[PDB]
Amino acid sequence: WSRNSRDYQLTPWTNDPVINRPGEAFYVADVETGKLYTPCAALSRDPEAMFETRHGLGYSILTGVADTLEVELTQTVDREKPVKFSQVIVRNKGSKSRRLKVYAYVEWVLGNNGQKSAPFILSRHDAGSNAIFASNPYSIDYSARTSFLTLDSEASGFTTSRREFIGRFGSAQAPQGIVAGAALSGTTEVDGDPCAALMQEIHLKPGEERHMTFILGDADNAEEAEALVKDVRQADFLSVLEESKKFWTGFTGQLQVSTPDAGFNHMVNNWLPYQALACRILARTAFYQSSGAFGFRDQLQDTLAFPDLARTQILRAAGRQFPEGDVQHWWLPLTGAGVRTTISDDVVWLAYAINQYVSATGDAAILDESIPFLKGPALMPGQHDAFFQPETSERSATLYEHAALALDLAIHRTGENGLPLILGGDWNDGMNRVGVGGKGTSVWLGWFLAGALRDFIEIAEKRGDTDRVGKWASHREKLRHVLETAGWDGSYYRRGYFDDGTPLGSASSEECQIDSLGQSWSVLSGEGEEGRSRQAMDAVMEHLVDEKTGIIRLFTPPFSRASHDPGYIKGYPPGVRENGGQYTHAATWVVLALAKQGRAQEAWNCFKLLNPVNHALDAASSETYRVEPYVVTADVYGEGAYAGRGGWSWYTGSAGWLYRAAVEGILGITRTDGKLHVSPSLPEDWSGFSIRITLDGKARDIAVSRKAGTADVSVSVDG
């Protein structure tokens, strides 16, 4: 993708887990014997071929060895450049001179989907610069960008038609027009299916390697594209790879641990922060979900596991609030167009993030940043969201004003029971149609609002707004009184109430008997009695106790029937997504609550269920998991014949949350007031660990023994 995912994709995005036809390919087909070698395992039908694929931190090297001919391919991107590098090494370890023909094939689908801009793609070929220029002049808002495919040599052949390259009666493994001839006619005329291919004839000798560099990328405007391709073709490759490796090592190198667990180190040290960044801030796209548009809570939460990133995201998020008080739950990056939904919990996430930032960094000067409002054509009581187009306004405000407006809207949006409404749904999107024109209260959002107020009372007292702090304090007292009185089920906390007054998340209901959100946040927020919180956490063990599959169920009874129509979550198959299945985002709060309450061994045991390594796919006959084990997944199915199957990985809101869990809930590393406070509770199967954090360029080797202490100097707890 170039600017926004599923808006200006370059090659096809087929989320087909069973076939997954490659969108681009690299062939090194021979001349004499006709054998076709490939570094990619999905493009090869040779049973006696060995393939090696390495997934590094910002690079991928795919090696394919067959018939004493090693073909190694490396992939990486260039920083501050919209260009993708592809380095092909054809290493000959035979005993005679071989003649080869290397191919570079790619599918041009520019925009959201093919079959729409299938005829309207223009392909060009340049003589001096051996490149293939493709543009999509029919796109709604991407009709001026050109993509290219060059090579750091003098290519001998090219084509821009699938009918010519792949042809009929052929697949990606036997492309016909790579084996049934030695001439690729250069086609420029527009036909049904566009593509691009390159060509190079090599005369190797025994013991020689040839180093190519295929280039793919784009930039708007033809002259800008030409300048960029000249620059890249004059550039080098190994320097780029070294730069990317250095950047990724230096980022992930700011926090290193040496815990005795072999599967814990390999995740927290390298993969969790990399996944968080590269799949939620840098590119909001994975194999299963593609959505390149900024979320509100998404972006607000993503940059919280770390320092300036949080500040940047807070400013950009708070600069998108309507003057009435509600914010944009969704907005595109460059146009700025978004939606104005009725979702309730959005306006309090900004308050929570500001509290977290001011607690961690301590820069009180962040509260004064004049940022404009927006202008929107209001809402009607007939719809739940509208797209329109925001317009900047001349009415400015600071961050404190924005947070105050958000809280004022939240307080105004309360039901008759005291607990806040949900309208279009709280954190769980599927739980909509419980408010909408009625009185749908909630318990999780009540806890979360009380938690935010618990610190904005202090902030207002420091600032000096007596009228506002008095109102907020009175409201907080009333809300916590309601939570203690209305919201308790007898052994745990409820979830909410429908429009009909029927309790949701209680033992009296046939479906959704027990939630987890309220129980976890009753400890996360800070309020609530110790005994009631302990009883709630013990009752959480009802859906946790399933250690046969190792998941943490959100609902014990999945929504099978529409007894009260809790929204569009009823459509999910039982045990799929947030319908009674494990949801890694919510279980992280469970492990954080268990860790903070004091129970250390239980917290570690629960965390072991979340780590993809030493989970399901640890042995060879763990085919049930089906998903890659080096990255945390969003959800794991919990019922039916697909119990234990993981789905929709990489693009998960659980990256930063799991990372922060592993940081303080286990290791106990907290930046309370700038100074680091260490307070660990090691499991009985551990002895000790050593952490190496580099805050403000200061690398400290904080080593914790069985009881306490530090390697640099002996200090007590809470350093």
Side-chain angles (χ1 to χ4, degrees):
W1 56 275
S2 182
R3 320 266 309 163
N4 185 69
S5 308
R6 64 181 261 180
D7 270 325
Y8 194 50
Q9 296 177 354
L10 302 189
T11 75
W13 179 65
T14 61
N15 47 357
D16 210 358
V18 287
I19 303 187
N20 193 25
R21 283 205 334 261
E24 71 275 39
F26 292 96
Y27 311 92
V28 292
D30 196 287
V31 186
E32 291 180 353
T33 178
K35 183 67 182 294
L36 192 150
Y37 311 92
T38 317
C40 301
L43 287 152
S44 159
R45 303 298 181 188
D46 192 76
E48 187 65 27
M50 281 265 158
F51 298 91
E52 293 291 329
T53 300
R54 284 134 68 96
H55 293 288
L57 276 298
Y59 58 90
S60 311
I61 304 170
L62 281 73
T63 313
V65 173
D67 200 2
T68 71
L69 188 65
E70 171 172 339
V71 184
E72 183 173 346
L73 186 147
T74 311
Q75 303 273 71
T76 187
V77 296
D78 197 349
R79 203 50 56 77
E80 74 261 9
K81 296 290 180 68
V83 62
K84 168 184 171 182
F85 283 120
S86 303
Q87 210 259 334
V88 183
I89 291 171
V90 179
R91 195 163 316 140
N92 191 356
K93 303 173 307 214
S95 295
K96 64 179 72 175
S97 62
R98 316 189 53 162
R99 303 184 72 247
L100 281 76
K101 300 169 76 171
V102 187
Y103 290 79
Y105 169 71
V106 68
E107 290 291 329
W108 287 129
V109 56
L110 310 175
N112 169 69
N113 201 2
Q115 312 153 14
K116 308 197 85 92
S117 64
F120 320 107
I121 283 170
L122 273 299
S123 305
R124 293 180 64 250
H125 179 251
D126 210 328
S129 308
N130 51 3
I132 296 165
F133 283 124
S135 169
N136 178 29
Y138 201 69
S139 186
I140 302 300
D141 201 2
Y142 298 101
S143 168
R145 307 181 55 74
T146 49
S147 313
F148 56 93
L149 195 56
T150 81
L151 171 61
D152 205 358
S153 70
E154 198 90 347
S156 57
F158 78 105
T159 187
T160 60
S161 182
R162 298 186 79 238
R163 281 68 165 288
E164 162 158 15
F165 187 80
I166 294 295
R168 285 197 304 203
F169 321 103
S171 46
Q173 294 82 17
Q176 168 89 327
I178 203 169
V179 290
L184 285 177
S185 52
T187 314
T188 295
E189 58 87 20
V190 185
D191 56 336
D193 271 26
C195 70
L198 282 182
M199 177 153 179
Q200 173 67 27
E201 206 158 343
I202 303 171
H203 207 67
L204 276 187
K205 273 146 55 153
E208 284 187 352
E209 316 177 59
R210 274 294 320 276
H211 288 203
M212 301 213 194
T213 304
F214 287 108
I215 307 299
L216 196 169
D218 72 347
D220 45 353
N221 190 1
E223 299 85 309
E224 183 176 0
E226 196 84 10
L228 180 147
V229 302
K230 211 192 296 278
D231 190 0
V232 164
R233 284 181 31 113
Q234 294 298 109
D236 187 71
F237 169 78
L238 284 146
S239 64
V240 165
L241 180 56
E242 280 303 318
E243 178 75 17
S244 67
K245 283 183 181 180
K246 179 267 159 194
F247 167 74
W248 282 120
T249 298
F251 184 86
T252 58
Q254 285 157 349
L255 191 149
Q256 291 298 111
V257 300
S258 187
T259 66
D261 206 342
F264 181 81
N265 294 346
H266 288 355
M267 271 315 268
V268 177
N269 279 320
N270 314 80
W271 279 107
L272 277 180
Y274 168 58
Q275 183 246 319
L277 277 191
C279 196
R280 295 182 65 81
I281 306 105
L282 278 299
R284 283 85 61 190
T285 313
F287 189 72
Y288 302 94
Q289 310 175 233
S290 63
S291 51
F294 291 159
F296 194 75
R297 46 176 154 217
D298 196 84
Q299 313 264 300
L300 194 148
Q301 289 173 357
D302 282 337
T303 52
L304 277 166
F306 319 126
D308 54 351
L309 296 174
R311 175 187 179 276
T312 306
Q313 288 268 52
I314 295 301
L315 268 72
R316 284 198 294 113
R320 304 208 54 77
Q321 177 175 3
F322 288 112
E324 173 195 348
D326 58 356
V327 297
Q328 271 197 325
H329 183 35
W330 164 32
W331 74 88
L332 291 174
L334 62 86
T335 68
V339 289
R340 198 193 199 166
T341 186
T342 61
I343 297 169
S344 167
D345 70 337
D346 272 332
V347 298
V348 191
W349 277 111
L350 183 63
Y352 185 37
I354 297 169
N355 290 113
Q356 289 272 10
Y357 185 36
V358 70
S359 306
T361 285
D363 51 352
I366 195 65
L367 272 298
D368 311 321
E369 294 294 328
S370 287
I371 44 170
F373 281 167
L374 294 176
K375 295 289 192 194
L379 282 173
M380 71 305 297
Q383 293 179 356
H384 61 291
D385 60 336
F387 198 50
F388 56 85
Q389 172 64 41
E391 188 179 2
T392 185
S393 68
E394 300 69 50
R395 172 160 161 58
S396 174
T398 61
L399 293 195
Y400 197 42
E401 188 39 64
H402 273 279
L405 271 178
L407 297 205
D408 279 326
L409 173 79
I411 302 321
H412 193 297
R413 292 208 299 222
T414 48
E416 52 89 11
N417 214 350
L419 294 180
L421 294 174
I422 60 173
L423 321 182
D426 62 357
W427 179 74
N428 290 138
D429 185 46
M431 311 274 266
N432 59 324
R433 293 215 300 272
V434 186
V436 288
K439 270 77 59 184
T441 81
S442 180
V443 181
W444 165 86
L445 191 152
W447 277 116
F448 175 61
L449 184 61
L453 269 294
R454 206 269 304 289
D455 289 319
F456 277 173
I457 300 299
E458 187 175 0
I459 283 178
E461 188 180 0
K462 180 67 174 66
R463 290 299 308 277
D465 287 330
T466 62
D467 180 71
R468 186 171 262 150
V469 69
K471 194 46 179 62
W472 284 353
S474 69
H475 176 81
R476 194 176 76 97
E477 284 293 327
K478 287 192 286 291
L479 175 72
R480 67 182 296 166
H481 201 167
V482 176
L483 273 167
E484 280 322 316
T485 60
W488 179 249
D489 191 57
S491 197
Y492 39 83
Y493 281 94
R494 301 175 190 266
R495 177 73 161 88
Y497 293 84
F498 283 97
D499 291 330
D500 315 328
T502 308
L504 174 79
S506 297
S508 87
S509 166
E510 183 202 348
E511 275 157 356
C512 182
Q513 289 181 358
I514 297 169
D515 45 353
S516 197
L517 294 174
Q519 286 78 244
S520 42
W521 264 102
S522 176
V523 176
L524 270 296
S525 89
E527 302 93 300
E529 301 324 324
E530 198 268 334
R532 308 273 280 277
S533 86
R534 198 157 290 244
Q535 288 167 226
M537 301 316 297
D538 289 340
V540 159
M541 292 315 78
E542 290 199 5
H543 50 59
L544 182 63
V545 76
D546 52 348
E547 284 263 356
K548 300 295 187 291
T549 60
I551 63 170
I552 309 184
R553 272 201 286 300
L554 205 48
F555 304 70
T556 58
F559 279 110
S560 65
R561 56 178 40 80
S563 59
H564 297 284
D565 198 2
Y568 80 100
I569 200 175
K570 68 180 180 179
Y572 282 140
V576 175
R577 310 280 302 132
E578 52 204 291
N579 194 339
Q582 194 251 312
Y583 201 77
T584 317
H585 198 143
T588 300
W589 300 335
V590 160
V591 76
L592 275 174
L594 271 161
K596 182 174 72 68
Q597 194 154 19
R599 296 201 256 182
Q601 181 58 255
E602 291 191 358
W604 174 241
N605 287 344
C606 297
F607 175 69
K608 186 53 65 186
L609 314 177
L610 297 175
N611 202 2
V613 298
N614 304 147
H615 177 270
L617 201 53
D618 200 2
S621 81
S622 299
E623 172 37 30
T624 61
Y625 198 40
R626 260 195 186 79
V627 66
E628 54 249 40
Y630 51 88
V631 65
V632 63
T633 182
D635 63 358
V636 176
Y637 308 152
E639 310 214 354
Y642 42 79
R645 195 191 298 189
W648 293 26
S649 58
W650 264 112
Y651 194 53
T652 62
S654 47
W657 267 114
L658 195 56
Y659 184 31
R660 186 174 35 222
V663 170
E664 68 273 16
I666 295 170
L667 279 52
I669 301 299
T670 71
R671 264 160 280 171
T672 70
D673 291 331
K675 65 185 289 185
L676 277 73
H677 271 271
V678 176
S679 59
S681 295
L682 294 174
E684 293 82 3
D685 70 41
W686 275 10
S687 177
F689 78 104
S690 310
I691 190 167
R692 295 200 61 253
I693 193 160
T694 65
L695 183 82
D696 292 330
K698 295 145 198 197
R700 284 61 61 91
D701 187 75
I702 313 299
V704 178
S705 164
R706 183 71 247 196
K707 268 77 58 174
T710 315
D712 47 34
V713 68
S714 182
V715 71
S716 82
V717 301
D718 288 331

